[PDB]
Amino acid sequence: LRVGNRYRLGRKIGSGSFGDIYLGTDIAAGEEVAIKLECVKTKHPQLHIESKIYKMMQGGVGIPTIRWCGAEGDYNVMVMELLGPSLEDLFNFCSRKFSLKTVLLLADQMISRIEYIHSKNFIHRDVKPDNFLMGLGKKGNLVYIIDFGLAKKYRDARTHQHIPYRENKNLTGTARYASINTHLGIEQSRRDDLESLGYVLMYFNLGSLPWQGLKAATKRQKYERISEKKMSTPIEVLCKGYPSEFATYLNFCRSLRFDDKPDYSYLRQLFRNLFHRQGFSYDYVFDWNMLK
Numbered sequence: 001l002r003v004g005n006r007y008r009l010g011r012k013i014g015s016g017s018f019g020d021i022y023l024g025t026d027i028a029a030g031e032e033v034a035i036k037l038e039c040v041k042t043k044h045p046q047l048h049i050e051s052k053i054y055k056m057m058q059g060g061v062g063i064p065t066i067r068w069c070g071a072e073g074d075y076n077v078m079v080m081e082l083l084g085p086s087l088e089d090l091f092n093f094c095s096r097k098f099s100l101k102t103v104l105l106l107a108d109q110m111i112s113r114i115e116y117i118h119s120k121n122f123i124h125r126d127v128k129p130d131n132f133l134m135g136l137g138k139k140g141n142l143v144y145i146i147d148f149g150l151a152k153k154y155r156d157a158r159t160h161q162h163i164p165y166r167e168n169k170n171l172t173g174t175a176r177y178a179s180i181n182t183h184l185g186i187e188q189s190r191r192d193d194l195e196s197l198g199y200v201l202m203y204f205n206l207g208s209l210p211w212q213g214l215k216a217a218t219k220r221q222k223y224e225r226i227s228e229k230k231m232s233t234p235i236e237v238l239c240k241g242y243p244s245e246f247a248t249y250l251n252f253c254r255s256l257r258f259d260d261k262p263d264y265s266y267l268r269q270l271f272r273n274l275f276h277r278q279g280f281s282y283d284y285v286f287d288w289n290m291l292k
């Protein structure tokens with residue numbers, strides 16, 4: 001159909017939290033775009049709140065620019081620059097195995113995306129492979145983070161007073177990568193986004209995490225098995241057979257206090273120093289860049 005006068009809606013290409021995503025074209029500008037559609041109906045107006053978070057993040061490296069936010073017909077609509085494959089997509093394309101060089105070159109950009117989001121007072125709360133997409137064209141090797149649907153403010157804009165420590169919370173994000181404290185129902189904070197990143201990295205190293213594939217009955221008790229397996233698996237076991245850097249990262253993350261400012265530079269240095277020890281070149285070539 002025809003959306004926002006300027007765009008043409010294409011076919012469905014995916015979903016995000018709170019809405020369906022479609023391919024499209026900005027006819028007036030000759031640009032291909034991604035369009036997220038949310039009913040202006042029900043109970044919850046998430047597309048509009050999320051849109052303000054993106055704009056607050058506009059300008060940062062690897063944050064998708066929003067071209068138009070508006071409502072039309074039955075939908076609130078947000079138009080975004082088209083982006084490439086997600087890290088999960090690429091992981092599959094690479095036979096579900098990434099070389100250490102690629103893992104380290106991904107960790108570098110991923111830690112910075114999280115630091116950027118945190119610098120603007122928000123926590124993502126759903127760090128996972130599918131929420132990271134590569135750019136296109138000149139930005140083909142830039143890793144973008146998307147979906148602020150479950151994002152939340154962790155400190156006051158003006159005073160920077162951190163939100164209060166809270167318990168008995170239900171899980172928000174993906175169980176597979178959620179932090180231990182998140183499973184324990186503790187309010188998520190900066191440390192939590194980083195811990196999750198730690199699991200995503202080890203996920204890329206192993207092909208799967210040890211708490212994956214557990215069978216249960218409820219669809220709520222599987223999170224209990226997930227949580228128990230996660231707690232029962234010491235870091236040294238999870239990372240056995242990989243550079244010590246990964247366990248040091250996870251250990252660092254679990255040691256942070258609820259309102260602590262993470263040392264993002266130190267985390268990136270662990271990986272850069274490892275990048276050097278392994279002898280890898282600084283050509284920034286990712287595994288998939290070699291697909292012949």
Ligand SMILES: Nc1nccc(-c2c(-c3ccc(F)cc3)ncn2C2CCCCC2)n1
Pocket residue numbers: 013014015016021034035036078079080081082083084086130146147
């Ligand atoms: N190709 C492409 N380019 C830009 C954004 C998105 C996108 C959005 C998204 C977020 C905000 C917005 F305004 C428009 C789209 N939510 C999920 N995805 C993808 C996740 C992986 C699978 C395919 C959809 N997709």
